Amino acid sequence: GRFAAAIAK
Amino acid sequence: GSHSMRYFHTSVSRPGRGEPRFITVGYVDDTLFVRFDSDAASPREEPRAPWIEQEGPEYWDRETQICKAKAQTDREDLRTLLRYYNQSEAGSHTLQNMYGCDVGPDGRLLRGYHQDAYDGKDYIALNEDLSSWTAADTAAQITQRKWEAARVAEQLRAYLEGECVEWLRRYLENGKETLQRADPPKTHVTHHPISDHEATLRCWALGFYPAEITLTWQRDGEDQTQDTELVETRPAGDRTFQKWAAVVVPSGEEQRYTCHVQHEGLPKPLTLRWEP
Amino acid sequence: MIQRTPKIQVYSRHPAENGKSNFLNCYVSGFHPSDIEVDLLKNGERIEKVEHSDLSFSKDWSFYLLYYTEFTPTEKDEYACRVNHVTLSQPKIVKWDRDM
């Protein structure tokens, strides 16, 4: 199962 | 034995040819189990191993949502990096990301990962402490500042030490038939004449899993690293891997040479010689 | 931009045995950028409907792919893999040798 938090560069 | 779960992601821009293509795959050790491709007919995360098919519809819906969000994030980040690096909008660029966890036979966390590359060069990486960052340059430092401000590492550490390890444990059990089986290499040595003066002795290892393996030649019991041709480990297409190592030996000196093979499927390291 | 040329291996899934069905593979690795063109050839001509794996990469960020097609090796038929890449001034052709 994947990491779900979106983190913008 | 020890195990790992890893997710891989690649976005590639293509100016003038629509939006960036996004592809991501998930692995347990060397076994591929899920994939998602934005150019596919109806993009959805798809199963690629028998043991993951039992997951229910909510699993596939949620995974798919995540994948789609990563594609969009990459598209925005690709624009951002064009600014950070003072680059034109005419070229193709690449963003890559890998994250995952490694566990020991007992199932506890040994090491976690999360790192990014821009155009094939290191960009930014979470350190082994899972709390601090290594930035490769002043551009990546701008991302670092934003990530330190948003407590991103805290978020990753939680995931890596919790969910990542628990999913790995679950998958190992559901796929125990294959994921917990090591296939030893089938080995033998071939002799190929080069001239009346020399021939190549090639030591083969076939049908093994997982991929990790050590193959070496010795002459009179001395390692021949410098004079050995060693090809990259390669996939056979049926889950297993292949590899060979070769040395050039003078006519009649074949018996001075011995091939050594180490693999997790072998209780004892192997020693082989050419048999006329 | 910094670029890396692909390594190329052409080989069979099982030991070659004349008249027996098998799988011909072309593994390309260690390359960047990821765009690349691969063909498998039978007697100089392109085999249709070849399949390929999903794009993925190594610890050093370099890309790798597997192209493959079912085949029945004989004594006379010559097989090969043909590769083009931004780093190659022209297509590189590697012949299948059942001893490698």
Side-chain angles (χ1 to χ4, degrees), chain B residues 10 12-13 92-94 96 119-120, chain C residues 1-6 29-37 55 61-65 84-88:
Chain B
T10 298
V12 182
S13 59
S92 173
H93 297 279
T94 302
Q96 294 161 271
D119 284 341
Chain C
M1 188 192 296
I2 294 310
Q3 307 178 310
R4 279 138 122 314
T5 206
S29 58
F31 62 97
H32 179 92
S34 59
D35 286 328
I36 189 167
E37 197 178 280
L55 187 65
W61 303 116
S62 73
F63 291 105
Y64 67 79
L65 288 171
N84 206 175
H85 189 256
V86 69
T87 57
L88 295 166

Coordinates of all heavy atoms in Angstrom, one line a residue, chain B residues 10 12-13 92-94 96 119-120, chain C residues 1-6 29-37 55 61-65 84-88:
Chain B
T10 N 8.1 7.4 -12.3 CA 8.8 8.1 -13.4 C 7.8 9.0 -14.1 O 6.8 8.5 -14.7 CB 9.4 7.2 -14.4 OG1 10.4 6.4 -13.8 CG2 10.2 8.0 -15.4
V12 N 7.9 11.8 -17.4 CA 8.7 12.4 -18.5 C 7.9 13.4 -19.3 O 6.9 13.1 -19.9 CB 9.1 11.2 -19.4 CG1 10.0 11.8 -20.5 CG2 9.8 10.1 -18.6
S13 N 8.4 14.7 -19.3 CA 7.7 15.7 -20.1 C 8.0 15.4 -21.6 O 8.9 14.8 -22.0 CB 8.0 17.1 -19.8 OG 9.4 17.5 -19.8
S92 N 12.7 18.0 -23.0 CA 12.1 17.0 -22.2 C 12.8 16.8 -21.0 O 14.1 16.9 -21.0 CB 12.1 15.7 -23.0 OG 11.7 14.6 -22.2
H93 N 12.1 16.7 -19.8 CA 12.8 16.5 -18.5 C 12.1 15.3 -17.8 O 11.0 14.9 -18.0 CB 12.7 17.8 -17.7 CG 13.5 18.9 -18.3 ND1 14.9 19.0 -18.2 CD2 13.1 19.9 -19.2 CE1 15.3 20.0 -18.9 NE2 14.3 20.6 -19.5
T94 N 12.9 14.8 -16.8 CA 12.5 13.6 -16.1 C 12.5 13.8 -14.6 O 13.4 14.4 -14.0 CB 13.5 12.5 -16.4 OG1 13.4 12.3 -17.8 CG2 13.0 11.1 -15.8
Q96 N 12.0 11.4 -11.1 CA 12.0 10.0 -10.6 C 11.9 10.0 -9.1 O 12.5 10.9 -8.4 CB 13.2 9.2 -11.0 CG 13.3 8.9 -12.5 CD 14.8 8.5 -12.9 OE1 15.6 9.3 -13.2 NE2 15.1 7.1 -12.8
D119 N 16.2 14.7 -13.9 CA 17.0 14.4 -15.1 C 18.2 13.4 -14.8 O 19.3 13.5 -15.4 CB 17.6 15.8 -15.7 CG 16.5 16.6 -16.4 OD1 15.5 16.0 -16.8 OD2 16.7 17.8 -16.7
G120 N 17.8 12.4 -14.1 CA 18.8 11.3 -13.8 C 19.9 11.6 -12.7 O 20.8 10.8 -12.5
Chain C
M1 N 22.9 18.3 -21.4 CA 22.5 17.3 -20.4 C 23.3 16.1 -20.4 O 23.8 15.6 -21.4 CB 21.0 16.9 -20.6 CG 20.5 16.1 -19.5 SD 18.9 15.3 -19.7 CE 17.8 16.7 -19.9
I2 N 23.5 15.5 -19.2 CA 24.3 14.2 -19.0 C 23.4 13.0 -19.4 O 22.3 12.9 -19.0 CB 24.8 14.1 -17.6 CG1 25.8 15.2 -17.2 CG2 25.4 12.7 -17.3 CD1 26.9 15.4 -18.2
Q3 N 24.0 12.1 -20.3 CA 23.3 11.0 -20.8 C 24.0 9.7 -20.6 O 25.3 9.7 -20.6 CB 23.0 11.2 -22.3 CG 22.3 12.6 -22.5 CD 22.1 12.9 -24.0 OE1 23.0 12.8 -24.8 NE2 20.8 13.3 -24.2
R4 N 23.3 8.6 -20.6 CA 24.0 7.3 -20.5 C 23.5 6.3 -21.5 O 22.3 6.1 -21.7 CB 23.7 6.7 -19.1 CG 24.6 7.2 -17.9 CD 23.8 7.5 -16.6 NE 24.2 6.7 -15.4 CZ 24.5 5.4 -15.4 NH1 24.4 4.7 -16.5 NH2 24.8 4.8 -14.2
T5 N 24.5 5.7 -22.2 CA 24.1 4.7 -23.3 C 23.7 3.4 -22.7 O 24.2 3.0 -21.7 CB 25.3 4.6 -24.2 OG1 24.9 4.3 -25.5 CG2 26.3 3.5 -23.8
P6 N 22.8 2.7 -23.4 CA 22.3 1.4 -22.9 C 23.3 0.2 -23.0 O 24.0 0.0 -24.0 CB 21.1 1.2 -23.7 CG 21.4 1.9 -25.0 CD 22.0 3.2 -24.5
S29 N 19.6 -1.9 -20.4 CA 19.8 -1.3 -19.0 C 20.9 -0.3 -18.9 O 21.7 -0.1 -19.8 CB 20.1 -2.4 -18.0 OG 21.3 -3.1 -18.3
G30 N 20.9 0.4 -17.8 CA 21.9 1.4 -17.5 C 21.7 2.7 -18.4 O 22.7 3.3 -18.6
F31 N 20.6 3.0 -18.8 CA 20.4 4.2 -19.7 C 19.6 5.3 -19.2 O 18.8 5.2 -18.3 CB 19.9 3.7 -21.1 CG 18.5 3.1 -21.1 CD1 17.4 3.9 -21.4 CD2 18.4 1.8 -20.8 CE1 16.2 3.3 -21.4 CE2 17.1 1.2 -20.8 CZ 16.0 2.0 -21.1
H32 N 19.9 6.5 -19.9 CA 19.1 7.7 -19.6 C 19.4 8.6 -20.8 O 20.6 8.6 -21.2 CB 19.6 8.4 -18.4 CG 18.8 9.6 -18.1 ND1 17.7 9.7 -17.3 CD2 19.1 10.9 -18.4 CE1 17.3 10.9 -17.2 NE2 18.1 11.7 -17.9
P33 N 18.4 9.3 -21.3 CA 17.0 9.3 -20.8 C 16.2 8.1 -21.1 O 16.8 7.1 -21.7 CB 16.4 10.5 -21.6 CG 17.3 10.6 -22.9 CD 18.6 10.4 -22.3
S34 N 15.0 8.0 -20.7 CA 14.2 6.8 -20.8 C 13.6 6.4 -22.1 O 13.3 5.3 -22.4 CB 13.1 6.8 -19.8 OG 12.2 7.9 -20.0
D35 N 13.5 7.4 -23.0 CA 13.0 7.1 -24.3 C 14.0 6.2 -25.1 O 15.2 6.5 -25.1 CB 12.7 8.3 -25.1 CG 11.4 9.1 -24.6 OD1 10.4 8.4 -24.2 OD2 11.3 10.3 -24.7
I36 N 13.5 5.1 -25.7 CA 14.4 4.2 -26.4 C 13.5 3.3 -27.4 O 12.3 3.1 -27.1 CB 15.1 3.3 -25.4 CG1 16.2 2.4 -26.0 CG2 14.1 2.4 -24.7 CD1 17.1 1.8 -25.0
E37 N 14.1 2.9 -28.5 CA 13.5 2.1 -29.5 C 14.1 0.7 -29.6 O 15.3 0.6 -29.9 CB 13.5 2.8 -30.8 CG 12.5 2.3 -31.9 CD 12.5 3.1 -33.2 OE1 11.9 4.2 -33.3 OE2 13.1 2.7 -34.2
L55 N 8.3 0.5 -17.5 CA 9.5 1.2 -17.2 C 9.9 1.2 -15.8 O 9.0 1.5 -14.9 CB 9.4 2.6 -17.8 CG 10.6 3.6 -17.8 CD1 11.7 3.1 -18.7 CD2 10.1 5.0 -18.2
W61 N 19.5 5.2 -10.5 CA 18.6 6.0 -11.3 C 18.5 5.6 -12.8 O 17.6 6.1 -13.6 CB 18.8 7.5 -11.2 CG 18.7 8.1 -9.8 CD1 19.7 8.6 -9.1 CD2 17.5 8.1 -9.0 NE1 19.3 9.0 -7.9 CE2 17.9 8.7 -7.8 CE3 16.2 7.7 -9.1 CZ2 17.1 9.0 -6.7 CZ3 15.3 8.0 -8.1 CH2 15.8 8.6 -6.9
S62 N 19.5 4.8 -13.3 CA 19.5 4.4 -14.7 C 18.3 3.4 -15.0 O 17.9 2.6 -14.2 CB 20.8 3.8 -15.1 OG 21.0 2.5 -14.6
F63 N 17.7 3.6 -16.2 CA 16.5 2.8 -16.6 C 16.9 1.4 -17.2 O 18.0 1.1 -17.7 CB 15.8 3.6 -17.7 CG 15.1 4.8 -17.1 CD1 15.6 6.1 -17.4 CD2 14.0 4.7 -16.3 CE1 15.0 7.2 -16.9 CE2 13.4 5.8 -15.8 CZ 13.9 7.1 -16.1
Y64 N 15.9 0.5 -17.1 CA 15.9 -0.8 -17.7 C 14.5 -1.3 -18.2 O 13.5 -1.0 -17.6 CB 16.6 -1.9 -16.7 CG 15.8 -2.2 -15.5 CD1 14.7 -3.1 -15.5 CD2 16.1 -1.6 -14.3 CE1 14.0 -3.4 -14.4 CE2 15.4 -1.9 -13.1 CZ 14.3 -2.8 -13.2 OH 13.6 -3.1 -12.1
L65 N 14.5 -2.1 -19.3 CA 13.3 -2.7 -19.9 C 13.6 -4.1 -20.5 O 14.8 -4.4 -21.0 CB 12.9 -1.8 -21.1 CG 12.2 -0.5 -20.7 CD1 12.0 0.4 -22.0 CD2 10.9 -0.7 -20.1
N84 N 17.9 1.8 -30.8 CA 18.3 3.2 -31.0 C 18.1 4.0 -29.8 O 17.1 3.8 -29.0 CB 17.6 3.7 -32.3 CG 18.3 4.9 -32.9 OD1 17.9 5.4 -33.9 ND2 19.5 5.3 -32.3
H85 N 18.9 5.1 -29.6 CA 18.9 5.9 -28.4 C 19.6 7.2 -28.7 O 20.5 7.2 -29.5 CB 19.5 5.2 -27.2 CG 19.3 5.8 -25.9 ND1 20.3 6.6 -25.3 CD2 18.3 5.8 -25.0 CE1 19.9 7.0 -24.1 NE2 18.7 6.6 -23.9
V86 N 19.2 8.2 -28.0 CA 19.7 9.5 -28.3 C 21.2 9.5 -28.2 O 21.9 10.2 -29.0 CB 19.1 10.6 -27.3 CG1 19.6 10.4 -25.9 CG2 19.4 12.0 -27.9
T87 N 21.8 8.6 -27.4 CA 23.3 8.5 -27.4 C 23.9 7.8 -28.5 O 25.1 7.8 -28.7 CB 23.7 7.8 -26.1 OG1 23.1 6.5 -26.0 CG2 23.2 8.6 -24.9
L88 N 23.1 7.1 -29.4 CA 23.6 6.3 -30.5 C 23.5 7.1 -31.8 O 22.4 7.4 -32.2 CB 22.9 5.0 -30.5 CG 23.2 4.0 -29.4 CD1 22.2 2.9 -29.4 CD2 24.6 3.5 -29.4

